[PDB]
Amino acid sequence: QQERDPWYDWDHPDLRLNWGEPIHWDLDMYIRNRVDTSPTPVSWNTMCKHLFGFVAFMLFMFWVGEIYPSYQPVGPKQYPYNDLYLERGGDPTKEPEPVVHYEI
Amino acid sequence: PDSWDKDVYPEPPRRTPAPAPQTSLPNPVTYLTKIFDLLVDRPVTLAREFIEQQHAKNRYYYYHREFRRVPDITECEEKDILCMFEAEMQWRRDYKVDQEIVNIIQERLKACQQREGESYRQNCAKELEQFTQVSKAFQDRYSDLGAHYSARKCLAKQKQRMLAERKAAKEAAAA
Amino acid sequence: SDAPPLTLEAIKDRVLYVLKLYDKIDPEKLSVNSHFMKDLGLDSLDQVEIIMAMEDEFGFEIPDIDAEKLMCPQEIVDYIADKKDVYE
Amino acid sequence: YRHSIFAVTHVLIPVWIIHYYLKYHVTAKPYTVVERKPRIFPGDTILETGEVIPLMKEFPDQH
Amino acid sequence: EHGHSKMELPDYKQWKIEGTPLETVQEKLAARGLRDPWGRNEAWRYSGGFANNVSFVGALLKGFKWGFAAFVVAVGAEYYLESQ
Amino acid sequence: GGVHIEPRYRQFPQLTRSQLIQAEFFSATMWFWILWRFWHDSDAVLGHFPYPDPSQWTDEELGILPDDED
Amino acid sequence: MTLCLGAITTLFTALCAITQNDIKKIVAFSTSSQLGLMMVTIGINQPHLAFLHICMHAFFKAMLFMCSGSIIHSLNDEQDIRKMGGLYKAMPFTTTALIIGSLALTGMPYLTGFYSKDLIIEAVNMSYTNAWALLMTLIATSLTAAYSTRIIFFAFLGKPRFPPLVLINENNPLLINSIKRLLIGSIFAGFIISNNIPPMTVPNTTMPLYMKMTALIVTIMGFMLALELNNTTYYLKFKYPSQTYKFSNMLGYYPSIMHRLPTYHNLSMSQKSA
Amino acid sequence: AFSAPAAYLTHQQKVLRLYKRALRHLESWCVHRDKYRYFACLMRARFDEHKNEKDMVKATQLLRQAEEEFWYGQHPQPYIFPESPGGTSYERYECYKVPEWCLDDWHPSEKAMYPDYFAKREQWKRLRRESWEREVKQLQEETPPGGPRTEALPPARKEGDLPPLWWHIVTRPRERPM
Amino acid sequence: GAHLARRYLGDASKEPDPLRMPTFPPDYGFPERKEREMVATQQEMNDAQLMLQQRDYCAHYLIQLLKCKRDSFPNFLACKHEQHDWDYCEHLDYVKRMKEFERERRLLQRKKRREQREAEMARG
Amino acid sequence: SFPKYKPSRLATLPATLDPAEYDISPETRKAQAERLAIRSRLKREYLLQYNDPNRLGVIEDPALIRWTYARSANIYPNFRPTPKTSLLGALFGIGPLFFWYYVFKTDRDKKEKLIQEGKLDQTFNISY
Amino acid sequence: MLKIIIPTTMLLPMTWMSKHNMIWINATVHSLLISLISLSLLNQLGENSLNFSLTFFSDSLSAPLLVLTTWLLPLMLMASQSHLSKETTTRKKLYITMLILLQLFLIMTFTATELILFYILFEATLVPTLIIITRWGNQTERLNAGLYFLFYTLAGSLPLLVALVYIQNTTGSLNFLIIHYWSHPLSNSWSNIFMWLACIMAFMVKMPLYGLHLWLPKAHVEAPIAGSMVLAAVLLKLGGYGMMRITTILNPLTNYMAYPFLMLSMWGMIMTSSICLRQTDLKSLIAYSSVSHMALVIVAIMIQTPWSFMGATALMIAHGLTSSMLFCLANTNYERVHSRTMILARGLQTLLPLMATWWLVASLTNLALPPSINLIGELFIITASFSWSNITIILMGMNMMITALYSLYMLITTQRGKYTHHINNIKPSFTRENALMALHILPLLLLTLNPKMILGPLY
Ligand SMILES: CCCCCCCCCCCCCCCCCC(=O)OC[C@H](COP(=O)([O-])OCC(O)COP(=O)([O-])OC[C@@H](COC(=O)CCCCCCCCCCCCCCCCC)OC(=O)CCCCCCCCCCCCCCCCC)OC(=O)CCCCCCCCCCCCCCCCC
Ligand SMILES: CCCCCCCCCCCCCCCCC[C@@H](O)O[C@H](CO[C@H](O)CCCCCCCCCCCCCCC)COP(=O)(O)OCC[N+](C)(C)C
Ligand SMILES: CCCCCCCC/C=C\CCCCCCCC(=O)O[C@H](COC(=O)CCCCCCC/C=C/CCCCCCCC)COP(=O)(O)OCCN
Ligand SMILES: *OP(=O)(O)OCC(C)(C)[C@@H](O)C(=O)NCCC(=O)NCCSC(=O)CCCCCCCCCCC
C-alpha cells in the first residue's frame, strides 16, 4: 500500500484506497505501517549478499582477534597480601600457602 | 532508638572521623547543613513535640497474642480430624514464623553489604555464613512441598530424609 | 514558525520576479496573462524548468499532473493560492 | 515575591513533610535507612571514642 | 504583533553573472556551445553578505585572537605576581 | 520576547550587535581556556614520565647469565 | 561480548553517519556511536570511566541537538543539509555553539569530551583485549572527526542554498540562554567534575609517546581526510556512486531486509497457518 | 491532486516526467548551485539531441534505456520537500484537521461564544441545502448514459447554480489549522 | 607494539605468554632477592576502603591523597603533590612490571640458547 | 552498460522499468479506458452519497464487507481436505507441540537426574 | 455468607416491582450497595478459612473473585442501559433478571464448600448466559454461538459429575475441608489417569485451553455487551478456580499428566498472540487476547508452586478487569459506527480525546506495564515457569513481545492517523461511558497499592 500514488485524491488518504474497489486479501499486512514491497535502488539479492558478507566478516575477524589478543609488554600486577587473599573471600582460619612477590 | 532491639538487629558502634580542615577556605557543606537545620529540623521538631504530647495525653496499650502449644501431627491418629486440624494450624503458624526469621537474617545481610562499603566481600562473612545456615535449614524443612503443602507432607519429607540419613550412617559405621 | 502570512500580491510579485530572471523570456514583454507556449515561444522543457524554478522559489512541490497544465503566470499564482489557502 | 512564595509552597513544604516522615516514621524501624560507613584514614580522631588512629610506617620519602 | 512591515522585493536588474562562479560555468558551457538560462536567478546567493567565504580552519579558529590576547595578559600578570 | 527582525528576500539578514558579541566572547573564552589549561597542564597531553627502553636494560639487572650458571 | 558489541556498534554507526544528509539523522548516529564507545569502555572493566563519559556526552550532545533544532526552525522546518548554505555569519551564536560542541565531541584537548574519551582510548589501548575491537574503536574515532567535519562544512561554510525569502532569526533570549548554559557546561564541566570526584581506578600513567598521542592523531587524520574529500565536491565533474557509498547510505541495508523479511514472514504465517 | 487522471500517460508526459526526475536527482547529487546549473544544462543538451526523433519505435527504445540509466544513477537518498510524500513533515498537521460537522455537536454554551461565526455557518448550510437539489439534477442531465467515463465534474452553467459536489472541496479544514 | 608482531609472526616459543608469566623461579637471576615492602597495613587500608584493585603496593600514597582531598575540600586543586606522588609510584610499579617482562623474555632466550648448544654438543 | 535490477517479492519491479507499459497495443488502451470508467462510476457513486446533506450515517462499502466476510466466514465452506492442506495442518499443528515436549522433557530429565545425584548447587534456592 | 446472598435474591422483587422508568437506577444503586458489603470478605486470616456454615466458606482465593463478581453487575447495567432503550419494560426486567440470577449463581459457586454443590452452581451459570446470548444478540450467529458454548461446556463437564460421585462413593465425602485433610496420593494407573482426565477436562474447557477455545470467539463476538463483560471477567475464571480446588486430590499424577496441557498452553499463547496481529474485528482481537492470558494462567496452575498460584490469582483478577474495560471501549465505538470492524473508524483521538486516553490506559494495562497487577501476575508466573524449566523464558518473552505488539497495534489503528471522511455521527462521549471506563480502571490502579488482597491464600 505504500507504493500507490501519493498524489491521487483517494477517498481514504491515509490508507490510499477508494470506496468500492476490491480490497487485497492481505490489506492489513500492507498498510504503510507494516511490511512494504516498494522497489529499492539496489536489488534484494545484492543487499542480502552485502549485509550477510559484512556481518560474517565482522564475526570472523572478532574471532580472529580473540585468537590473537593485543596487550602491552608488562607482567601481571602484583598484589601485597598473599594475592589479597583475605579481602577476596576470606577464610581466615585456614592459613593459606604464602605467595610473595619478587622485587626487581 | 528504643523502638527495636539492638541485639536482634546488630549495628557496629559507628566510628566517625572528626572534621580536620586543612585550609582556611570556608566549605559550603557546613553552612548548608546549618541553614538546613535552622530552616527545616527546628519546625519539624516542634511539630513532633506537639504531636507526641498530644499522644501522651491519651495513652492506651495493645497486646501481643500468646498461643498455647498443641500436639503436633506426629502424635495424631490417622483419621482424627480435630487433632489433625489443630496440628495443621500450629504447623502453618510455625511456617510463617520461620519465614519471618529468614527475613530477619536477609535484612541483616543487606544492611551489612550496604554499610561495609568497598570491603563488604571481607567484612560481611559472618552474616553471609549465618544466612547460608538458615537458608539450608529452611530449604530442608519446606522446599518442594508444592502449592498444596500440609503438615503430613512435611512429615513425609522429614521421614524420607531421615531414612536416607539412617542408611548412610549405618553404612558408614559398618564400612 | 514566525513566518509572514503571504498574500496574493506577494505571490504574484514573486512569480513575475522569478520569470524575469529567465533570460529566455524578454522581461519587458511578459505579463501576468502571457501564455508560455504561444505568447512567449517556449518549449515543453522550458515550461517544466519554469515549474521547477517556482517550486524552488516557494519551497513546495507541485505534482506532475497539476504542474504539466499550468500555462500562465496568473494560472501559477492561482494554483499556489489554492494550495496555500490565501484568500486576500 | 513570586519566587519566594513558589519556593515556600514547592520546596519548603515538601521538604518539611519528607523530613518529618523520614525522621519519625521511616527511621523508627531497623535497617530502613542505611549509610555506608565514613572512611577512616591514619591520623584522624573519632568523635565518639576520641582516640587517634596511629600514623603510617614513615616510608622513604624521596621525590 | 508579528512581522508586518510591507517588505518590498528588490530590483531584478542587480543580479549579474559577472564576478561569480556562474561566470566560469558560463565559460565552460559556451566552450561546448550552450548557455544557462537561469544564471541570473541564482546570483543572489553570491551578492550581499554571502559574497565572502570562510575556510574550515578559519571557522574553527573563530575567536582565537581575543583568546590568545587574554592568555598572554593573564600569563604575564601571573609571571609578575609570582616572582615576589 | 526578543526583538523585531523583518525578512530580506535575497539579502543578508539583520544581525544585532548582542548576538555578535556573545558569539565572539564565547569563542574567545573557549580558546583562552584551552591555552590556559594547556600551558598549566602540558603533561596531560604529553605525559609526565618517559617511557623506558627495554633493550637498554643490562643483563645483570634482569639476571641474565649466558649458559654460565648451569 | 560487551566489548565486541560496543566495537561493532560504534564502527557501523559512524560508517552510516559519514554519508547521511539529514542533520538529525547524523546526530542520532553520532549518539549511537558514542553509546557503542561507552559499552566498549564497559567491556575493558572500566565502569566509572563509562559513567563519566555519560555525564560529558549529556552536555555536548544535548547542545548539538539544540543547535540542530535552531537551524531547522530558522530555515522553515528544513532538515536536509543540501538546502543549508552559508550560516556561519547569518547565525553566529548557533555557529559558535555548534563548533564548540563538535570540538568537544571530537575530543579536543581540555574540552568536556577530553576527560572521558581521551582516557577511554588510553584504557582500551593499554589492555588485554581484541585486536579487531581496538582497530574498530580507532577507526570509529576517525569517522567521528570526519562526520563532525561533514556537518560543519555542509551546513555553515559554502554559499547559501535555502529558498530566497530569508526568515533567519536568532534573537530570542530563551534560545540564547538555553544554548549558552550548555555551552558553559561543554567548556568547563569536564575539568570541574574530573577534579572534584575521588579517584576510583588506577591510571595509565606511563605509555609510549605514539600510543599516548593516538587519539589526537586519529581525530586529526579524520578531520583532514574528510575535509579533503569534501572539497572535491566543488569540482565540475560527475561520477556515479560506488558500492561502498550505497552500502553506507542505506544503513548497511539492515533496515531494509530486517524490516521486510521477518515482519512479512511473521504476519503472513499469522494469518495463513495460525 | 486536483486534476483528474487520464486513461494512460502519453509519450510526451512520460518524457517530461523523466526529465523532471533526472534533474531533481542530479540536483540531489551535485549540491552546489553552479555545479548543478552546469550539469543541468549538459543534461538538457543530452535530453535534446533526440527531440526530433520522428518515428515511435526507436523513440520508444529511447526513453526505455534512459529509465534503466536513471534507476542506476538515482541517488538513493534524494532531496524531498518537507511537505512532499517523502518529506520530514509530510502529515505533521494532519491530526489538527477537525471536520466542520463537529461544529454541529457543540454545546449551546459553546455556541454562545462566536455568534457571528455560527450565523454565517447557518447561511452556508442553507446555501448548500438548496444547491444540492439543483446539482443532483444537473449532474443527472449532464452525465452520459452508462455512467461517467472519467473523474471530471462539469462546472455550474446557470446564474444561481454552484459547481456540482462543491461542499467538501471548499470546506476543507485548512492547510495548517493550528 | 612490536612484541605482538614478534610473537604472532616469528617464533612463539621465544616470546612469553603474558597469562602464565613468570615461568621461571625468582632466585634464578641472583640469590639476594630483596623483598617488596608494603607501607599500608591491613586494618587501616581496610578502613580507607579504597577498592580491591586499588590495594596494591602504592596504597600509602593513595591513602594520603584521599585524606588531603577530604581535608582541603573546596579548594580541590590543593592536593597536587599527593596526586603526583601516587602517579609516580604507579609509574615505578609499571616500570617494574616491564622489567619483569623483559627478564622473562631474556631468560627464555638464554634457556633456548642453552638447550640448542647442548643439542649441538650431543650431536657432535 | 548498467547492471540490471532484479525484482523480488519484497522489492518489486518499478513501473518505469515494466516492459508492459511500453508494449502498447490498442486493446491495452481499451482495457485502460474500461478501468478508468469503472473507477469513475465508483467515484461518482461515492461522491454522490458523500456530499448529500441528508445523509447522517456511514456510507457502507460492499467491498469492505466482502473483504471481512471472505477473511472470516467464507473459509470453512470452501475448505477441502487435500494433500497440501492435510500435510500443512498436521505439520504446523502437531510438530511444534512434540518438539517443545521433547525439549522440556529432556531438560527436566537432566535436572531430576542431577538433583538425585546431588550435583546441582541449589544453595539459596528458597522461593520456587 | 447469607448477608450477601439474601440481598442479591431480594434484588429480583425490587426490580419487578419498580416503576417503568426507575429500574436501572434502583438496580444500579442496590447492586453497588451489595458490592460495598462484599468488601468485608476481603478481611481474611492467614490460617484455614472463613467457615461460615456447613454449606458456605470463604477463602483468600474466593474473596477477590466474589468482590469482582459483585462489582461487575453495576457496570453491566450501566453498559446495557443504552442499547436496550427501545425495549419493552417486561423484557428489560427479564434482562436484569438474567443478570441477577447469573450473579446469584456465581456468588453461590465460589463459596460452595462441597464439590457437587459447586458443580451444580458451576453448571447452573450456563443457563442465564445462554439465554442472554441467544435472545439479546444482534447477528444471526448468536444461535450457533449459543450451541457451541452450551455443548463444549457440557461435554467437558459431564465426566466431572461421574468422577465426583465416584470419589464420594470411594472416600465418603466431597467437602473440601475433609478432602484436603484426608488427601491420599494417586497411584500411576489407567483408572487413575482417566479419573485425572475426568477431573481436569471440565475446567480445561472453560479456561479455555488451546484447541478447546473455539467456542470463545463465537460466544464473545456474538454476545451483547453485558454478556461479553460477564464472560471475559468472571465466567472464564470459574475453571481456573475449579482447578485450584481439585488438584489437591490429583497428586502426584499431576506431574506426569500435565505435560500435554503445558505444551498446549505454552504454544497456544504464542499462536493466539500471533492471531491477534491479523484481526479485522475488535471483539475477536480482545477474545484472542483473553485466550492468551488464560493460557498463561493454565500454565501457572499446572506448575503447582506457591508463586504460580499467587501469580495466577493476580492475573485472573487483573485480566477480568482489563478485558471488561476493553470490551466496553469497543462497544462505545460500535454503538456509533454499528460495524465492529477495526479499520473502518479511524483517527478517533481527534474527535474523542478522553476516549483516547481511556483506550491508552486500557492498552497499557493489557500491555503488562509495571507496576500494574497484570505485570505482577505475569512476572510471578514467569518466575515460577523459569524455576520449572529454563527454556520457558523463550516462549514467555516472545509472548510478552507479541502482546505489546498487538495492544499497540489496536491502539494505533483506531485512535491514530486520519479520520474517516464519510463518518459524521461520532457524537461526544456521554457521562455514562466515561464513568464506566473510570469505574473499570480506577480499581486496577488502586489494587496495585495493596497486592496481597489479590495474591490468593498462598501469600
Ligand atoms: C598501523 C598503521 C597506521 C596507519 C594507518 C593508515 C593511515 C591512513 C591511511 C588512509 C587509508 C584510506 C583513507 C580514506 C578511506 C576511504 C575514503 C574514501 O575515499 O571514500 C571514497 C570511496 C568511494 O567514494 P564515492 O563512491 O565516489 O562517493 C560518492 C560521492 O563522493 C558522494 O560523497 P558524499 O558527499 O555523499 O559523502 C562523502 C563520504 C561518503 O564516502 C563513503 O562512501 C564512505 C565509505 C568510506 C569510509 C570507510 C573507511 C573505513 C572503513 C572501515 C570498515 C571496517 C571493515 C569492513 C569490512 C567489510 C567487509 C564486507 O565520505 C566521507 O565523508 C569521508 C570518508 C571517511 C574518510 C575519513 C576517515 C577514514 C580514515 C580511516 C581509515 C584507516 C585509518 C584508521 C586510523 C587508525 C589506524 C589503524 O570509498 C572507497 O572507495 C572505499 C575505500 C575503503 C573501503 C574498503 C572496504 C571494501 C570491502 C570490499 C570487500 C573486501 C574483502 C572482504 C572479504 C569478506 C569475506 C566475507
Ligand atoms: C489529577 C492529578 C492528580 C490529583 C491527585 C494528587 C495526589 C496524588 C496522591 C495519590 C497517589 C500517590 C501515592 C500515595 C499512596 C499512599 C496511600 C497508601 O499508603 O495506602 C495504601 C492502602 O490502600 C489500600 O490498601 C488500597 C485500596 C483498596 C482497593 C480496593 C478497591 C475498592 C472496591 C472497588 C471494587 C473491587 C473490584 C475489583 C476486585 C478486587 C497502602 O497503605 P498500607 O501501607 O498497606 O497500610 C495503610 C496504613 N495502615 C498501616 C495503618 C493500615
Ligand atoms: C471437550 C470434549 C471433552 C470430552 C471428554 C473428556 C474427558 C474424558 C475422560 C474420560 C471420561 C470418563 C472418565 C470416568 C470417570 C472417572 C471414574 C474412574 O476413573 O474409575 C475408573 C473408570 O475408568 C474408565 O472406565 C475409563 C473408561 C472411559 C470410557 C469413555 C472414554 C471416552 C473417550 C476416551 C478417549 C479420549 C480420552 C481423552 C480425551 C481428552 C479430550 C479430547 C475405574 O474405576 P473402578 O473400575 O471402579 O476401579 C478400578 C478397579 N476395577
Ligand atoms: O514540445 P514538448 O511538448 O515540450 O516536447 C518535448 C520533446 C520534444 C523533447 C519531447 O516531448 C518529444 O516529443 N520527443 C520526441 C522523441 C524523443 O524525445 N525520444 C526520447 C529521446 S531520449 C532522451 O530523453 C535522452 C536521454 C537522457 C536521460 C538519461 C538519464 C540520466 C540521468 C540520471 C540521473 C542523473
PDB file of N, CA, C and O in Angstrom, chain J residues 15 21 32 39 43 56 66 73 75 85 96 99 115:
ATOM      1  N   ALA J  15       7.512   0.654 -12.093  1.00  0.00           N
ATOM      2  CA  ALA J  15       6.613   0.819 -13.231  1.00  0.00           C
ATOM      3  C   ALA J  15       7.358   1.319 -14.461  1.00  0.00           C
ATOM      4  O   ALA J  15       7.096   0.866 -15.582  1.00  0.00           O
ATOM      5  N   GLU J  21       4.219  -1.564 -20.054  1.00  0.00           N
ATOM      6  CA  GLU J  21       3.779  -0.210 -20.373  1.00  0.00           C
ATOM      7  C   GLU J  21       4.359   0.303 -21.684  1.00  0.00           C
ATOM      8  O   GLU J  21       3.856   1.297 -22.216  1.00  0.00           O
ATOM      9  N   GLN J  32      -7.427   0.020 -20.399  1.00  0.00           N
ATOM     10  CA  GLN J  32      -7.210   1.186 -19.547  1.00  0.00           C
ATOM     11  C   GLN J  32      -8.453   2.071 -19.498  1.00  0.00           C
ATOM     12  O   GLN J  32      -8.816   2.589 -18.433  1.00  0.00           O
ATOM     13  N   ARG J  39     -13.541   2.950 -12.258  1.00  0.00           N
ATOM     14  CA  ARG J  39     -13.185   3.839 -11.159  1.00  0.00           C
ATOM     15  C   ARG J  39     -14.051   5.091 -11.171  1.00  0.00           C
ATOM     16  O   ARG J  39     -14.398   5.626 -10.114  1.00  0.00           O
ATOM     17  N   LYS J  43     -16.378   6.266  -8.144  1.00  0.00           N
ATOM     18  CA  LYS J  43     -16.125   7.553  -7.509  1.00  0.00           C
ATOM     19  C   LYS J  43     -17.351   8.452  -7.572  1.00  0.00           C
ATOM     20  O   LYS J  43     -17.635   9.190  -6.623  1.00  0.00           O
ATOM     21  N   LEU J  56     -26.743  11.167   7.304  1.00  0.00           N
ATOM     22  CA  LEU J  56     -26.250  11.349   8.668  1.00  0.00           C
ATOM     23  C   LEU J  56     -25.848  10.004   9.268  1.00  0.00           C
ATOM     24  O   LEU J  56     -26.232   9.653  10.385  1.00  0.00           O
ATOM     25  N   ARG J  66     -17.304  -7.524   1.828  1.00  0.00           N
ATOM     26  CA  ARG J  66     -16.821  -8.716   1.138  1.00  0.00           C
ATOM     27  C   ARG J  66     -15.462  -9.144   1.670  1.00  0.00           C
ATOM     28  O   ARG J  66     -15.218 -10.337   1.880  1.00  0.00           O
ATOM     29  N   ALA J  73     -15.691 -15.658   7.502  1.00  0.00           N
ATOM     30  CA  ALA J  73     -16.808 -16.594   7.477  1.00  0.00           C
ATOM     31  C   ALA J  73     -16.887 -17.446   6.218  1.00  0.00           C
ATOM     32  O   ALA J  73     -17.703 -18.373   6.173  1.00  0.00           O
ATOM     33  N   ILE J  75     -14.322 -19.243   4.964  1.00  0.00           N
ATOM     34  CA  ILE J  75     -13.204 -20.182   4.905  1.00  0.00           C
ATOM     35  C   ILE J  75     -13.706 -21.622   4.878  1.00  0.00           C
ATOM     36  O   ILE J  75     -13.443 -22.368   3.928  1.00  0.00           O
ATOM     37  N   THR J  85      -3.254 -29.306   2.189  1.00  0.00           N
ATOM     38  CA  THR J  85      -3.889 -28.820   3.411  1.00  0.00           C
ATOM     39  C   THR J  85      -3.686 -29.789   4.566  1.00  0.00           C
ATOM     40  O   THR J  85      -3.377 -29.376   5.687  1.00  0.00           O
ATOM     41  N   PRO J  96       5.339 -28.464  16.307  1.00  0.00           N
ATOM     42  CA  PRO J  96       5.805 -27.635  17.431  1.00  0.00           C
ATOM     43  C   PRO J  96       5.481 -28.229  18.790  1.00  0.00           C
ATOM     44  O   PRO J  96       6.310 -28.149  19.705  1.00  0.00           O
ATOM     45  N   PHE J  99       7.916 -31.110  19.406  1.00  0.00           N
ATOM     46  CA  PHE J  99       9.263 -30.563  19.532  1.00  0.00           C
ATOM     47  C   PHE J  99       9.475 -29.944  20.911  1.00  0.00           C
ATOM     48  O   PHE J  99      10.468 -30.231  21.594  1.00  0.00           O
ATOM     49  N   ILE J 115      19.662 -33.628  40.310  1.00  0.00           N
ATOM     50  CA  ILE J 115      19.202 -33.433  41.683  1.00  0.00           C
ATOM     51  C   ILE J 115      19.366 -34.713  42.492  1.00  0.00           C
ATOM     52  O   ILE J 115      19.847 -34.684  43.632  1.00  0.00           O
TER      53      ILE J 115
END
